[PDB]
Each structure stands twice: as C-alpha cells, then as structure tokens.
RNA sequence: CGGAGAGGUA
DNA sequence: GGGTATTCGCCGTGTACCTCTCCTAGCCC
DNA sequence: GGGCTACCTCTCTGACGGCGAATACCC
C-alpha cells in the first residue's frame, strides 16, 4: 500500500524516493518493455534476455543482494528490498515489535 | 559469410555504443553492418551486429567502453540469434 | 494504508527466497541440483519436458548445441524449454503420491 | 547523391527506386521518409545543401519548403561554425551522412562550397554593416519593348517612378485595386529585362491559392507563408530572407526583394504601454530595420526592396504603420480606388507618384520630357489623365515616339 | 457484428468511431480503435471506418475494432495511395454552380437575383453579411433547395452551431442532405469538437475527389466559442479551396453585424478581408417585406470572369451601371418587375439590349 | 516525520 | 556404496543517548 | 541544460566462530 511506502515531502522539487518505490518503478519498466516486445513478435534472443532482465529485477524487488551484485542506488548505497525491512536488527521485529 | 549476434550492455545504451563501434572497426581494419530499430521503441539497448565469431573479435566486442558483452548460455561461447528471426526483425525494421 | 494492488507479469518468474533458501526448496523437490537451476531460470541452458519416445531423460540438462543437435534427429516429440516457464511446467508435471 | 535532386524527382520514381533496393513498401509512406530511407540504404557518400540557420548549433533549411523545419535538415555542429566563422544565411554545400544510432539529423563532415564560392574567398570578406550606402545609379528599366498590350503598365511605371538598383520604394494602394496584377507585371518585367538579378518574392500571411499562383507564374524564387501559420514563422521566414540577401550582397550580387506584406509583417512583429491604434512602442523597430536594409553598395552589388503598403483597410493600426513608413522610403507609387472602380487598368495615381533624385537614372532630355509631361497631366483630373495617357500610349509602341509627338 | 462511424483520434494516440445520428457526440457504446490499426492504414481524424467489431471483454468499456472492411466508402487499397489535403494546390473558382431552378416558380426569384449579383462556383469562399431579422433563414433554405435540385451529386452539409433546437429539426426535415448541429444546451467544448469533425470529414472527401459544400450559419457564433475557450476560425474559413487534382470545398458562411455588440463588428471587419464574396442584405428592404432583401450595390464577386462568359459578364456590367444610380428600394422594385415578366433570366437579358 | 558515514558520553 | 578433507563466501555482531556531514545528473537534442 | 528514459563499473566488505554443505578425497 502507498501509505506504507510514502515519499519524503521535503522543501523542494527533488525527492529522496524510497528504495521500494524505485524498485517497483524498475519492475514496471522492465515489464511494460516485455509486454510490448511480445506483441511485436521480437526475436527470441531479445525476449530471452529481457525475461532474464525481468527475472533479475523481481529478485532485487523481493530480496536484493542475495543472488549476486546488489543493485545499488545512485552511485554506491545499496537499496532496501522487501526482505531487508523484515530481516536484520532494523526489521519490524527487532525494531518495532 | 557473416552471422548475427547481439551486443548488449545495461539496457539503454544502444545509441552511443554503435557510434564508437563503427569507428573502432575502421581502426582495426569480420564486421558487416549494425542496424538500429526504431519507430516514429523496441530493443531498448539491444543492437544486432552482422559479424563472424572469432577469438580476436571476442575481445574487440568487449574492448569498446561502456558495454557488457555478449549474452548466451555461458561466458565461454556466445549464442547466435536465429536464421528466420533475423529475417523477421528485418521485415519489421522496414515496415 | 490497508489495501494492496497487483501487477500482471508478462512472463512467469521464480521466487528468490525458495530458490536460494539453503537448502533450496525448488532444488531438492525435483532432485535437480542448484548448480544448473540458476542457469535454467536465468536463460542459460535447457531442460527436457515430456521427452517421450527418445533417448533423452525426464529432467536432463543440455546446452544450446545439444539442443540443436538433438533437434536434428528428434524434432517431433522432443520438447525442451528454458526459463521459469520450463520449471513451472515441470512443477505441474510432478506428482506427490507417486 | 544530392538532396535537391531527389526532391525534384516524382513520387512514382521514388517508390519504384525504393522497391528495387529491398525496403518497406513505399506506397503508404511520405515522400520525405522515402528519400530518407533511400539515403540510408545507399550509404550502407551523400551530398546536400541549404541555407544555414544558426540557433550555438544550426540546420540547413530548404527553399522549396519556405525555410520550414523539416526532418531532413542537416545538423551543423558549433565547432565547424566557430572554425569557418559561419553566420545565418551562408549557403553551405558539402558531404553529409545519415543519422547514426540515437541521432535524428544529417551531420556535416566537410564543406565544399560556401555561398556559391570557394571558402578561401568567404573567409576574407567585408560585412554588410560596413558597406558604404549610395543612391540608385544603375537604371533598371521596366519597359518590355516588344509592343505587347501588357507593356502599358510598365510604360506608365517608367514615366511615373523609374526604378534603379538599391531603390527602396513603397506601393501605396487600398484593397481591391489591382495589386496582384501590378506585382505580376513587375516581377515578369524584371525577369525578362534583367534576368541576371536575383529575384525573391516574399508573401507573408496570404492566401494559399495566391501562393501557388505566384510560384507558377514568375521566373524566380518564391518564399511565402500562408495565413494558416502563426506569426512566429512569419518572423523566422522574414529573417532568413533578409539574412540570405545580405550574404549575397556581401559577395557583390544584385538582390531584388518584392515585398507584398509590409503591413502584415508589421502585425507579425506587433503580435510576437500602447500607442494610438494598438501599436507597441518597440513593435515597429524590427520592420524598420528590415525595410531600411535596402541600399546600394559602392564596392559591388545592391539590394532592392519594394514593399506594398495597405491603406483604408478599416483598421487604425494599419494607418499608423503606413503613416510611420511613409517618411522612410524615397519612392511612393499611389493607386487610386476611384479609377479602379471604373475598370481603368492600370489605376495609378500619376499626380502623387514620383522619385527623388530621378536625374541619376534618366538623361537630361528624358528628365525634361518627363517634367513637361507632368505639367500637362497635373492640371487634368486623376481619371482624365489616365484616359489621356492610355489613349496616347496605345497609338505607339515606345515612349520615345510619344514624347516626340507632344512637342 | 458490423459497425460504422467517423474516426476521432484523441491526443493520447487512440480514437473512437462517433455516430452520425448523435451529431458526433461521445457515447457509451463508441467503438474503440487500437493505435496499431491507425499506424497500419495511416488513418486520421475524419476517416469513415466501417468494419467488424466485438463486444468489450472483462475490463473494457468500448467495442474493439478487429478488422476494417471499408474506408471512406472505398477499399483500403485505394485510400492508402492518396494525396494529403495540405499538399493540394488551391485554385480559383472555375466550374459554374448555377443556382437557377428553371421551373419558373416564384421561389426561384431569390436564386435568380443571387446569380446575377454573385455567381457561386466550386471552391468559393464567401460571406453572407446580414443584420438580424433580415431573411437569413429563408435565403438559406432557398440556397439549400436550389443546390439539391440543380446539383444533386454535391454533398450538402448544413452545420448549425449554437442555434435553436426547433430550427434544427425544421432544417433537417426540409433540406435534402446531411444535417449536423450542436444546440446551446451544451458548452462550447462540444461546439469546437463538432466543428472539427465536420472540417476533417470534409477534407478527407476532397482528398477522395468529392465536392463538399458546407453552409455554416455560425461563423459569428463559432468565433464567440473559440474566444470563450480569431486564429482557429480563420483557418476553418480559409480551408475552402478549389483543388486542381480533384474535388473542391465551398464554405458559405453567414456573418452577423449590428447585433449591439462591438465584438461582432471586429469579427466581421477581420473576416471581410479574407473571403472573395460578400452578399450584403439591407434591413430597410427586409422590414418592407421585400424578399430577397439583397443589396445589389454592396454585393459582388471577385474574378467573376472565370465563372461567366464574355456576353454574360457584359450584361451584368450594364445591369450594374443602371442599378447603381437608382436607390436601394427603387432597384429592387425595378428588378422584381422585370424578372416577373418572364420565367428565365435569358429573356430578361434579351429585353435589356 | 529519511538512508549511510564520522566523532563523543555512560 | 560413503566418511572426512577443501572451499568460498554466509550469517552471529551489547544497550541507550548526543552532535555533524553526505545526498544523480547521462545523452544528442 | 535537459525529457522522458537514459548512463556508471565494479563478483568470486574480509576478517573470524563455525556450520551444514556443495564438491571432492580418499577408506
């Protein structure tokens, strides 16, 4: 739900968007690309990899950094997936429960 | 006879990767033609290249900056696209 | 705050948790080692699905060349796929009681 | 492989040529997309040309499209502009290449010809702002001499206001008087008598049927803009014309501009503190420079701009524009509506017509015969003088025989 | 399932097929047009699309277009190789569109005076200048009936924007043609949309070599609509042109003057210098119940020699030289008494000489 | 109504 | 047939409090 | 400078406590 992942209404036009909203944005980007790529009947060599790009996009959405190179933010900082908000010392259990 | 392969970086860099690729070809003096599909956009960063698969060319396609390389079954050998699919994208490239 | 939404994916995908659970739930369920499961899901190899009357195995793994080679002598009942749909179809073809 | 050559080819040949190259079916395609597709397939050298329009970058507009922004414009990098000191109006002709992956316009590699001349002659040149202006010295006679019935309009124009090189006149005429037929007779006479001069017809905010009529009637270049286009294009077209004209004069060329929308052009700048009539204080400054740009160069070349002003149009704004530009030029050719209602063509007001410093274009005996003719025409009325002039000019073919019989 | 309608491409890329009986109004049962089919056939706004449709599935609210069968009352193979309206070369009026009935009826007197004063041809762009309560309704019906009687092949479209509903039903049940209107019961947003759907449909027919004649009695009303929501109405008026490659577009509009508002005067003064035909009507002759109350001196047509012969132009010139010295009422009484002696204008010309 | 890093206190 | 011997990353990081900083601009247009 | 939408470079932050475990080494 959007209230559980809001933005940062700071003073200005820029927004330090949440890592989850950025991840959901990338998945929709990589999905609408694949949805259009199939109606055009593109070659398999493109559909095959683009599904892998979609595959590696959902994995970061669920649990980023576990498979391999963690999808970073701007330059260095990694992004918090859905697992990071429940796993660890900063999860809901050991920080809010 | 030259075959078709896909030069693939992180999706989005179709534009400048080819301008440097053509210029890198004329410096090394095995490469037929690189096409750009577009509409009035499919393959958001996947470029089809007419070339032959050689050990020297394997490093050349990886020596161009701002690119990952070929994608296939393993990093040992790249995977071709198809014989009929090249004609399929060629038809949609015109029409 | 208390209602959600969904997204219709253009292609099925696998869950990273069950894929890398240590031990992998997907792995030991199909007797398939995790070493090649990563290549199948990430579109890096092939797996047989309902081979039929041929010299193949139920869950044999074969590369691109072996895919093309086997297609030459067997291209009627031979059926190999790659990605999450291949394993998804393999999951539905599996049986519990047997 | 030239751009202008493929633009002149018909659509049937372009579709047939494209099908032989193995491309998309060119039936459901635009002509510009057809040429763009042929250039790509043929490049897998290409040459082009056009007038430069510097924005730091710029493009090469085409003359057949009235300098409109098209997809086939050749991109000009600012590095080449800073290297050759190129400006807006310089004709550039060189090798071009199709746009690569991620590009949308043709790029310029090497320039071959600058302003229809070698680049070594354009790098060293005197600017138009430094040329010394002068009065009209060379005589641009408008009389045909073939004895045609349409030559009477040119014969009266020569006796009323002789036109020379670098002349900046005004054609004052109310609407529905015959400005269209008068402009055609002038343009046809210029192309017939002086075919070496560069004739340019500018029609801003006019009817499309009139645009295609003038384009297929006069022997020259026709750059026009219909009323369906906003005032922004009217300003851009006017600037591209005056910039190209200045560059030609800098190369010692005789440029002739037959303007027919000086009133419409002023409305264009006024649209893009309010005085009497709805005219802005800084709105007439731009048409003022565009009009006064006409001048005679002593080093070589000239610039002639003949504008047609609109009066009695029912709008007070046009009256202020006309009254301000009245004291700007040095030639006024007034037309009478009362004579036009009588179907007496041409309906020229010979009384208020005239040219300052007319002795620099006519001989001593010719100026005296014109002076005596005016002293006989002035006492008679406007309609009576035209009927007298037409009946006397119809008896002979040349104006010399008419003056000989008056004495 | 078969359907039909005029295409209206939205700004987002897709479009719908409006209905003709609803005066091009957005309905809940409109046929959705996918952008893929628009790119396939190069369809634009105004193209009459008729083909197979299907009911909406779960999650849809419009009928999807599966396959188009007929485009602009023609095969798609003939509409794919066409010339755009922006590339057509305009020309002056060449063909003569005679309005005279020829039956010798008293209703033909309006058309007879109109032919002697302002001959109308193909591609004409004129204005019917008339104050309120001058006879614009009766004059319009006489023109529409004369066109359907003399030239039944021409497509007559009477677009009435911001008018009375009872007058719309009266005109639709009287003239022989298509009648699209948009009453004042709805805001100017629909007035602009209906006006665009008509001009787009008209341009497509001209591209298909058709002679479209539009009698728009709302150029004053349409100008107020754009001013509430002169660049747009001027392009709509100037769209009328005679195409050399084939077809023509004639737009006869009625301007409103002396309506008590200075805004209409500026609109009339600006559009006066655009067209090439002005048919002024006198209020004094209209209040005297003398129809048609046409101001013969104020009327006229530029380049009339391209629509009339040499002898016909001379007779009209001699007629004007006699009518001009006489007054407005005296000229009408003279003209009516001379035209009542015979039935056709040929006998009138023979008696004047 | 944030995320990392640095320093300090018990 | 399996019972140990490498190996390469893999999850185990005391509590609370205070101060301060850093935060994306890339490409042909 | 930027508008929709591209554009960086690095995998096998490195230790230890060890732990079941994929691979591998004999018993």
Short mmCIF file of C-alpha atoms in Angstrom, two decimals, chain E residues 44 46-47 72 82-91 122-123 155 157 198-214 239-251:
data_model
loop_
_atom_site.label_atom_id
_atom_site.label_comp_id
_atom_site.label_asym_id
_atom_site.label_seq_id
_atom_site.Cartn_x
_atom_site.Cartn_y
_atom_site.Cartn_z
CA UNK E 44 -6.54 10.22 -39.45
CA UNK E 46 -12.38 12.21 -40.33
CA UNK E 47 -11.80 8.82 -41.98
CA UNK E 72 -14.27 6.35 -46.63
CA UNK E 82 -3.75 9.30 -51.60
CA UNK E 83 -2.56 12.91 -51.52
CA UNK E 84 -2.88 14.88 -48.29
CA UNK E 85 -5.06 17.99 -48.17
CA UNK E 86 -2.07 20.11 -47.10
CA UNK E 87 -0.27 19.27 -50.37
CA UNK E 88 -3.18 20.05 -52.71
CA UNK E 89 -2.66 23.11 -54.90
CA UNK E 90 -5.56 25.57 -54.46
CA UNK E 91 -7.07 27.47 -57.37
CA UNK E 122 -16.77 25.33 -56.87
CA UNK E 123 -14.31 26.22 -54.12
CA UNK E 155 -22.53 16.65 -50.76
CA UNK E 157 -23.76 19.63 -45.19
CA UNK E 198 -17.01 18.25 -39.94
CA UNK E 199 -13.99 20.03 -41.43
CA UNK E 200 -11.88 16.88 -41.07
CA UNK E 201 -14.55 14.77 -42.77
CA UNK E 202 -14.83 17.44 -45.47
CA UNK E 203 -11.07 17.46 -46.11
CA UNK E 204 -10.99 13.67 -46.42
CA UNK E 205 -13.76 13.73 -49.03
CA UNK E 206 -11.86 16.39 -51.00
CA UNK E 207 -8.85 14.07 -50.89
CA UNK E 208 -11.16 11.37 -52.29
CA UNK E 209 -12.20 13.71 -55.16
CA UNK E 210 -15.54 14.87 -53.74
CA UNK E 211 -17.27 18.26 -53.93
CA UNK E 212 -18.15 19.25 -50.36
CA UNK E 213 -20.39 22.29 -49.85
CA UNK E 214 -20.76 23.47 -46.24
CA UNK E 239 -9.85 25.77 -45.67
CA UNK E 240 -12.29 26.21 -48.56
CA UNK E 241 -10.34 25.94 -51.81
CA UNK E 242 -10.61 24.58 -55.34
CA UNK E 243 -8.26 21.63 -55.86
CA UNK E 244 -6.77 21.10 -59.31
CA UNK E 245 -6.06 17.39 -58.75
CA UNK E 246 -9.73 16.74 -57.98
CA UNK E 247 -12.65 17.87 -55.85
CA UNK E 248 -13.36 21.21 -54.22
CA UNK E 249 -14.51 22.72 -50.92
CA UNK E 250 -17.08 25.53 -50.80
CA UNK E 251 -17.90 27.15 -47.45
#
